Amino acid sequence: DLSGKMVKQVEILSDGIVFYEIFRYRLYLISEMSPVNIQGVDLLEGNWGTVGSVIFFKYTIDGKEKTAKDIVEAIDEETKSVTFKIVEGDLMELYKTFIIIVQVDTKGEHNSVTWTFHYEKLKEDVEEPNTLMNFCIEITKDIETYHLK
Ligand SMILES: [Cl-]
Ligand SMILES: [Cl-]
Ligand SMILES: [Cl-]
């Protein structure tokens, strides 16, 4: 079984509404908020925040520069979810398919962000994407702590 799933939920100190705003409509802000990790987010087709939009990422993992081109496969505005399908880039050298779901809980009480990966490895010895999950959680912490008062 070359297919896998990885899920991590973290509670955030910042407003979930704003976190979802970023991931849906203003994804380019993550260059500014997590500049060590993300060097560019470039819309290529469509409109920010719409299903089918195509986005190019320039990022750095373990000090090495990588790229990805993603399609926004799904949006659920009620559950504050957005699903990104990776279609090209370094990850495609290891995974046949890779989907990342970001889902934000804003019940009111608290706020959390859940990151879900669904992937299929090209080979059995390909690693689980722990380093990428750590990266995503880091980005999340950079956003939540950006310009704290
Ligand atoms: Cl900006
Ligand atoms: Cl950017
Ligand atoms: Cl849409």
140 phi, psi to nearest 5 deg: -60, -45
Percent of residues in the chain assigned helix, strand, coil, to nearest 5: 25, 45, 30
Closest ligand to C-alpha of residue 71 is 3
Answer yes or no: are the C-beta atoms of 119 and 98 closer than 8 Å.
yes
Task: Name the resolution in angstroms.
Answer: 1.5
User: What is the distance between the alpha carbons of residues 121 and 57, in angstroms, rounded to a whole number?
Assistant: 21
Query: Which residues make up the environment of ion ligand 2, defined by Cβ < 5 Å?
Result: 28, 31, 40-41
Q: Radius of gyration over alpha carbons of the chain, in Å?
A: 15
User: What is the distance between the alpha carbons of residues 3 and 63, in angstroms, rounded to a whole number?
Assistant: 27
Reading the block at residue 90, the tokens are 């370094």
* Experimental approach: X-ray
Going from the Cα of 28 to the center of ligand 1, the distance in angstroms, rounded, reads 6
For 1-149, CATH number out of 1.10.1200.10, 1.10.3470.10, 3.40.50.300, 3.30.530.20 equals 3.30.530.20
